Each structure stands twice: as C-alpha cells, then as structure tokens.
Amino acid sequence: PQITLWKRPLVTIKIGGQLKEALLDTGADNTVIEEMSLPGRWKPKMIGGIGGFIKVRQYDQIIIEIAGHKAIGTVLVGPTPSNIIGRNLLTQIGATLNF
Amino acid sequence: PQITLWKRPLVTIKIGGQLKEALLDTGADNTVIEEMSLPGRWKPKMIGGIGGFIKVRQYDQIIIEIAGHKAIGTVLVGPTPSNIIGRNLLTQIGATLNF
Numbered sequence: 001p002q003i004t005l006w007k008r009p010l011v012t013i014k015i016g017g018q019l020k021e022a023l024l025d026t027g028a029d030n031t032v033i034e035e036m037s038l039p040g041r042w043k044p045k046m047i048g049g050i051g052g053f054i055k056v057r058q059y060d061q062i063i064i065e066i067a068g069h070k071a072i073g074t075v076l077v078g079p080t081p082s083n084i085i086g087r088n089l090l091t092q093i094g095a096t097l098n099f
Numbered sequence: 100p101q102i103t104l105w106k107r108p109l110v111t112i113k114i115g116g117q118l119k120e121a122l123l124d125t126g127a128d129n130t131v132i133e134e135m136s137l138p139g140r141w142k143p144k145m146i147g148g149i150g151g152f153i154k155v156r157q158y159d160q161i162i163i164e165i166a167g168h169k170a171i172g173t174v175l176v177g178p179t180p181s182n183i184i185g186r187n188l189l190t191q192i193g194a195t196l197n198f
C-alpha cells in the first residue's frame with residue numbers, strides 16, 4: 001500500500017498471538033513493543049530517543065506480522081509510550097520513503 | 100526519489116542559509132533541529148519522545164530546503180540527539196511510506 005502522512009502511520013501487527021497497533025517509524029533503528037509477557041529468552045537493554053533512555057528486554061528471532069507481511073527480528077519490550085516498528089523490520093517488508 | 104531503509108534515511112537540508120543533515124522521520128509529528136541561532140521570534144514549547152520531554156523553541160513559518168524540495172512551516176529547535184524532519188514538513192514535499 002501507500003501510506004500518506006496527514007496522520008500518524010498506524011498499522012495492525014500480530015505478535016506472539018496478540019493483534020496490536022504500531023507506528024511505522026523510519027527514524028527508529030529498533031522495534032519497541034509495549035510491556036508484554038513474551039515467552040523466551042531475553043537480554044537486558046537500554047534505548048534512547050528524545051528525552052532520554054528507557055530500560056527494555058531484548059528478544060531475538062521474534063516473528064511479527066506487519067499489515068499482513070511477515071518479518072522476523074529483534075523486538076525490544078518495555079514501557080514505551082507507543083508500539084514502534086523500526087527499520088530492522090521495515091526493511092524486511094520492503095518499505096520505502098518516496099517523494 | 101525512492102529511499103530504502105537499510106541505512107538511516109538522512110538527507111541534506113538548508114535552514115537559515117546553513118546546510119545541515121537530517122533524518123526523514125515518519126514517527127515524528129514535528130520537525131526538531133539541534134540548538135542554533137535562527138532569526139525570528141520563537142515561543143517556548145515542550146515535546147516528548149521515547150525517553151521523556153524536552154523544552155524547545157518554536158519557530159513558525161520557517162523556510163527550509165530538504166533534499167532540494169522547498170517547505171515552509173514550523174521548526175522546533177532544542178537539545179535533540181538528532182535533527183529530524185517530521186510529518187508537518189514531510190507532507191509538504193509529498194512523501195509517503197510505500198510497501
């Protein structure tokens with residue numbers, strides 16, 4: 001599809017059996033998902049942006065469905081104010097910026 | 100042009116007559132630039148991100164060239180870890196996310 005930017009680009013994702021809404025963010029290197037009991041091993045991590053850093057748990061090899069497209073990669077889980085799909089996943093679904 | 104996301108989507112912008120580099124960011128409502136002198140009246144504002152809130156100066160109706168495409172609108176200047184071109188200006192140059 002083609003997403004215009006008049007409003008935040010929100011899509012439905014399916015992660016670990018749960019369907020959610022996440023922001024497609026070209027300025028995010030990583031994918032950050034809201035607090036959730038995901039099964040599996042994880043590593044403690046810290047990520048930053050505007051305002052500072054937050055503590056997250058890093059899960060690798062996660063499978064996620066972005067608007068009907070499958071991708072597999074690292075997902076960071078923590079108290080983020082919003083679910084964010086970073087470039088790590090965006091590249092796997094062939095997303096581009098056009099103008 | 101068509102920009103893939105294997106690398107950060109960085110472009111050269113010009114503001115106040117000074118060249119700069121910035122990140123095309125679909126997950127930002129606004130355009131934030133690192134602290135600099137910009138001619139004009141500005142107002143105190145607060146914006147938030149992944150790590151919290153930061154104080155910025157709001158500059159209304161500023162002229163800016165992004166990758167050679169002209170935009171005129173609000174630019175916020177503050178302690179950002181990276182220069183960011185948000186949706187308010189991305190819409191002005193006709194940018195859309197595609198996949």
Ligand SMILES: CCCC[C@H](NC(=O)[C@H](C)NC(=O)[C@H](CCC(=O)O)NC(=O)[C@H](Cc1ccccc1)NC[C@H](CC(C)C)NC(=O)[C@@H](NC(=O)[C@@H](N)CCCNC(N)=[NH2+])C(C)C)C(N)=O
Pocket residue numbers: 023025027028029030031032047048049050081082084086107122124126127128129130131145146147148149180181183185
């Ligand atoms: C229109 C009026 C707005 C008023 C104002 N609005 C806001 O603050 C809105 C919600 N904020 C935003 O849109 C802000 C950007 C600032 C702005 O646009 O104003 N967006 C953001 O901060 C979004 C996340 C987000 C989006 C929506 C809601 C909440 C959070 N992140 C943008 C950000 C860009 C980065 C280069 C600094 N990316 C990140 O923070 C990601 N982090 C990373 O990718 C790290 N690996 C690297 C960080 C440093 N980068 C670098 N050196 N290149 C991500 C994994 C957290 C508020 N006061 O009410």
